[PDB]
Symmetry: C2
Subunit: 469 residues, 2 copies
């Protein structure tokens, strides 16, 4: 037996039933999103669900709607204006609808024939985005399900170019291939190094400054040291928007050092790459136009529903030469880590069009303005300290109250994070950084106002007043 609405009949025979079911789900979702501020940024404690059994018989539409209601009510809620803790934003309206459209036609990015109206669009759109990064006329890339895959693919190509490893692999080598990255760079570099057969220890950390920016003098020292240890450097990764503090490495200096030493220059701009849409702020990315490859994630600061990420190459032909396996448009499955892929280009393209470059410029500038308000508040309070200068709309800071022993500060900041969430409905993350627990604000929600930040500080001050501070 099959339920009457298990599939949509292509000759209309269950139209009314399908329309009714779809409408109930759409109405539920619209009620939950237009009323998202009625739910806290994080859900009430879970209740530990028990073993799952796959049912024999079809579930009723009533059961399915209750399931959806429960999954929404139990989910994280970045649409709450007090959600200010992670690089996970509320989705653009056209990103929600773009996924509805993509799931409905259910095409496959594996090949042109399986995605005739999406494949060429993706290739053309990513050439246009590469132009915004200034990479030049040979540039292009592919969409990937997440920035970790984009980093994996960039590093795979860097490895394959340096060691000609597509067919014979790298097991024959007598010196260990190594890459350099900031001590503040993302752990997907180590995951990638493991996957690529380099091992996690192949990612050599470079000292970051007090402002969490890679130190070019230490990069030189580490490169010299690796060669002296008989290692084989092949890539430098600069990070444009570090995860914890949102800082941007000095891309032009790092790139110049990579080029002097013949190393592939990869820029992980997962977060900070969005600045290419801001006339006012994109100078921070100066030097990125010379990258050999760039990772960029519209699912972070371009508000595209997860996942949406890409890897761009200054010479797209490199994917043919040093990636694609042995056998004018190239089937995208041949030149990505994935074969079959969801049509993320639909939500990306609809969202880019709906918001426009000028809309992102507004979002980004307002993000900076809110971050600056947080910085101001932190600076004026002796008991709160910044992790360092900020380069994006992210502020990492913590209490260092001089009336408590330093040994107690982690507990203090943890208790503060919990109180802000439980009583203020304001969510900050609490990363481990420099051996301690720090608070972290990521000012992404378009509906977070100055008043939310003011309310945060009022609660922080009241908490700080408890133990005689």
């Amino acid at each position: 037996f099959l339920p009457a609405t298990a599939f949509i009949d292509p000759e209309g025979r269950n139209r009314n039933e399908v329309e009714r079911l779809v409408q109930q789900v759409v109405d539920l979702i619209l009620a939950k999103l237009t009323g998202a501020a009625e739910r806290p940024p994080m859900p009430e404690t879970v209740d530990l669900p028990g073993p799952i059994t796959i049912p024999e018989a079809a579930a009723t539409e009533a059961t399915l709607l209750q399931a959806i209601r429960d999954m929404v009510d139990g989910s994280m809620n970045p649409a709450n204006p007090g959600y200010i803790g992670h690089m996970d934003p509320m989705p653009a309206t056209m990103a929600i609808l773009g996924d509805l459209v993509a799931a409905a036609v259910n095409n496959n990015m594996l090949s042109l024939e399986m995605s005739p109206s999406f494949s060429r669009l993706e290739t053309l759109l990513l050439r246009a985005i590469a132009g915004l990064f200034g990479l030049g006329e040979q540039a292009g890339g592919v969409l990937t399900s997440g920035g970790s895959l984009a980093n994996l693919q960039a590093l795979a190509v860097a490895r394959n170019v340096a060691f000609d490893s597509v067919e014979p692999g790298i097991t024959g080598l007598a010196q260990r291939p190594v890459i350099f990255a900031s001590e503040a760079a993302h752990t997907s570099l180590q995951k990638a190094a493991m996957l690529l057969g380099l091992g996690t220890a192949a990612v050599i950390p470079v000292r970051a400054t007090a402002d969490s920016r890679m130190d070019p003098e230490d990069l030189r020292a580490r490169i010299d040291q690796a060669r002296g240890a008989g290692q084989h450097p092949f890539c430098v990764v600069a990070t444009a928007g570090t995860t914890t503090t949102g800082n941007i490495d000095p891309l032009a200096e790092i790139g110049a050092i990579a080029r002097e030493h013949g190393l592939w220059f990869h820029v992980d701009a997962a977060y900070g790459g969005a600045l290419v849409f801001s006339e006012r702020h994109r100078w921070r990315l100066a030097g990125i136009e010379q990258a050999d490859s760039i990772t960029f994630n519209p699912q972070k600061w371009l508000y595209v529903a997860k996942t949406c990420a890409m890897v761009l190459f200054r010479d797209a032909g490199v994917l043919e030469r040093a990636f694609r396996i042995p056998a004018g448009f190239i089937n995208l499955g041949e030149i990505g880590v994935q074969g079959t892929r969801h049509a993320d280009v639909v939500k990306l393209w609809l969202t880019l069009q709906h918001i426009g470059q000028q809309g992102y410029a507004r979002l980004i500038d307002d993000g900076y303005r809110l971050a600056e308000r947080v910085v101001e508040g932190v600076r004026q309070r002796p008991f709160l300290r910044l992790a360092g200068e900020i380069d994006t709309n992210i502020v990492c800071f913590r209490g260092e109250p001089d009336w408590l022993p330093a040994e107690r500060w982690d507990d203090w900041n943890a208790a503060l994070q919990a109180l802000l969430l439980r009583e203020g409905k304001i969510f900050l993350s609490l990363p481990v950084y420099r051996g301690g627990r720090w608070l972290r604000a990521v000012l992404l929600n378009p509906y977070t106002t100055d008043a939310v930040i003011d309310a945060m500080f009022k609660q922080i001050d009241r908490f700080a007043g408890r133990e005689r501070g």
Copy 2:
């Protein structure tokens, strides 16, 4: 500037405007899907500019219309060529729900309902495969990534490579797989630093099933050639012909030689939902890892795929990098779309009874194609069929063999152009073959009978 409906205001202030925009898209999609048979199975640009100023809602709706009209259309009952099905209704709705709450499978904190659900659900599915009480796995964006992760683990267990990597080995690590296995194995071998040449092909039979004798043999030969075997991959539903390797025999050989046993059940894994057909997978229960893709024969909108391990702990031991488990720590991806929502809602809506029905109807339709091919001397089967996939071709005796590829290509083009029936045309055994994948639940006997009528008319000219 930002248009008023760019986001949904969480305090309700743009509700009417957002509702109207969403309803326009929903109405368009419903019209195109309930009228999908009005579009053929396959459809009939210059540079792209990212606009400075927001596009109008008119422009956006026209873009959606054009994208849909220009898309491949597996919902047409004549679409019978690929393992790409029309999606289940709840899978479409499940992705609407997933995108709306926009949670992140990277960590429990960022997906507090969805993470535990995924873990528990994949334990239940591992149960259907008979993998035992330590089994578990992760959802992955596609079966290629599932295969990559299984082979990464296999490599890491054999060579202790998480931290030091695999450079400086005296012997080349190698993987055995059928000559008919999926090319994601070669892509994975390349990514893993093993090289595409590390995938050693094993002979397949006339029915495109791995030959165990050839395997046992290849293993002996590789050790003789200084190579270091560490994994055997059996395929349960090969891509071109849909055949299933003899899993029990392949597995016995892998265990005799201490090799990781991976089963790529991307397509044929769905048989665990059929009491009538799951005997075909006998032996899969002993696998160290399984790849399975609900996005194929369980009708879940792409992507939806998983890798299962008989011992889930192996992911902590031989995958997770040095400092409930946050899922990002034990998958190739970090951040991931919440595929579990579409999977769970679809499984609940259709049920195992529903899939048992869909699967046996696929077999019945495939058997009708098989009978049609047997009755015609000019049409030849590739071999026996194991799943609802039939690969066949014209070998007309009144035509020189060097003209058969063109004859089959012309037939495929004609079936599509005049019949609105889509078969794929793979290269197989160095020639062009037709390939039927009988997945659309609305494909009927009448469609198959119509294809054969058209084939006969083509053959009589």
